[PDB]
Amino acid sequence: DIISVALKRHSTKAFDASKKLTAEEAEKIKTLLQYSPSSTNSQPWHFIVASTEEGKARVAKSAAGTYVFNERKMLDASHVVVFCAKTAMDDAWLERVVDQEEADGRFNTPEAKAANHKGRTYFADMHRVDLKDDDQWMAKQVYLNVGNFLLGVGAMGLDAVPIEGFDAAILDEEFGLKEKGFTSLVVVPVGHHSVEDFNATLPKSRLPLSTIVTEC
Amino acid sequence: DIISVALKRHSTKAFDASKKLTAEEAEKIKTLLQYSPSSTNSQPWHFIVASTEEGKARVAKSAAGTYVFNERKMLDASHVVVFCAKTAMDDAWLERVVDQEEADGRFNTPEAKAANHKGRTYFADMHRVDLKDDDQWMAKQVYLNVGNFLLGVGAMGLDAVPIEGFDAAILDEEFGLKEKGFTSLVVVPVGHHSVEDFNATLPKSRLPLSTIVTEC
Ligand SMILES: Cc1cc2nc3c(=O)[nH]c(=O)nc-3n(C[C@H](O)[C@H](O)[C@H](O)COP(=O)(O)O)c2cc1C
Ligand SMILES: Cc1cc2nc3c(=O)[nH]c(=O)nc-3n(C[C@H](O)[C@H](O)[C@H](O)COP(=O)(O)O)c2cc1C
Helix, strand or coil, rough: CHHHHHHCEEEEEECCCCCCCHHHHHHHHHHHHCCCCCCCCCCCCCEEECCCCCHHHHHHHHHHEEEHHHHHHHHHCEEEEEEECCCCCCHHHHHHHHHHHHCCCCCCCHHHHHHHHHHHHHHHHHHHHHHCCCHHHHHHHHHHHHHHHHHHHHCCEEEECCCCCCHHHHHHHCCCCCCEEEEEEEEEEEEEEECCHHCCCCCCCCCCCHHHHEEC | HHHHHHHHEEECCCCCCCCCEEEEHHHHHHHHHHHHHHHHHHEEEEEEECCCCCHHHHHHHHHHHHHHHHHHHHHHEEEEEEEECCCCCHHHHHHHEEEEEHHHCCCCCCHHHHHHHHHHHHHHHHHHHHCCHHHHHHHHHHHHHHHHHHHHHHHHHCCEEEEEEHHHHHHHHCHHHHHHHHEEEEEEEEEEEECHHHHHHHHCCCCCCCHHEECC
């Protein structure tokens, strides 16, 4: 029951450094990252999936100073996913998206593909040209991916914890994302919580529906 | 299997206007909106859940002109959720969150509550003062909620379609959101797709893992 999952999944505060994801689970979390929806199927993202001790150590460089209290989560987890967004929407990327859709058989005619491309470009330009906010627009799609991911891993019976408490400048530099056209937004360690993960047993807390929801 | 859900859910292009969510399902989608995680559990959001004909018609007003291709989705779906983000992070809201967590028994000691309050304040301020980007920060949390929601309704066997193709200015004005301290970001009609939903049978398309994922 997905509703039970939502009422049960939690932000892991401690991971068992001995429990690793199975090969199948590792394949599945990558599938979750890949198949998340996005505006115009723009998929303005890239993901770093660190599973080796060296890889996790590189990501952990971002848990410096003020963020040092997040270091252990990044080091003890089985797999650590760094969610990155494109820094600018280039035509090259838009072309890749529409060409992939054609390859997957989503268009019944060439005109249909051209129309899809025109439309995606039209909305991309709305952000790139008019609003000048394509960077924030794409970052938003990445957070949506994070939302999809957290519930998905929870539904897999796996533990995870979303992290904004990291130095993105440091992380970007460590992986040369700037030069690749990406920037890190959220770090998500995934694995199995340890017995010491006190947050696994604390009740979930949210504001009441009477405050957050308006029915019409 | 949640992975089968991710590989099967799709953006509904046509809903069967006669199929409504059951009372239980209507309560469950609200639970999904409410329990989505967010940075510091800030829950910087508000949701309009329109299920009456006039309610949906009012939301549909935002799908005028260029966006008319999204009008029928909003009108025919059973429940249409308008995802809104707060326009500014006020101290009262921050206090509400910690006080709610205290009320929910998440703090065994006063020191525990203090640590939580300290942490939230530090990062809320980082965005409200240091970066002056709390509007974008909260919007990001709302998109995360959307990602959680789409996968959730999918796992419930319900159809939906996320929508950015609407005039937020019109929608905000229609529901007097600005005066209430909110702004609309994404509209999500939820229901059951009709056999005329061309996207229900089209293959899902995403760029290859070799392009979007880096393993370390
Ligand atoms: C934030 C967001 C906004 C979107 N807006 C629209 C919209 O206005 N109309 C529409 O038909 N689809 C819309 N889409 C659906 C995308 O085209 C879709 O998610 C993508 O092509 C991948 O297909 P899927 O959702 O079937 O997996 C939106 C998706 C997201 C995630
Ligand atoms: C974008 C985002 C960033 C977050 N960052 C951190 C972090 O840096 N460290 C941490 O321990 N928890 C972090 N959290 C966890 C929140 O405190 C948590 O999601 C929230 O309190 C609700 O509790 P839940 O996830 O157990 O349901 C983050 C959550 C989100 C959604």
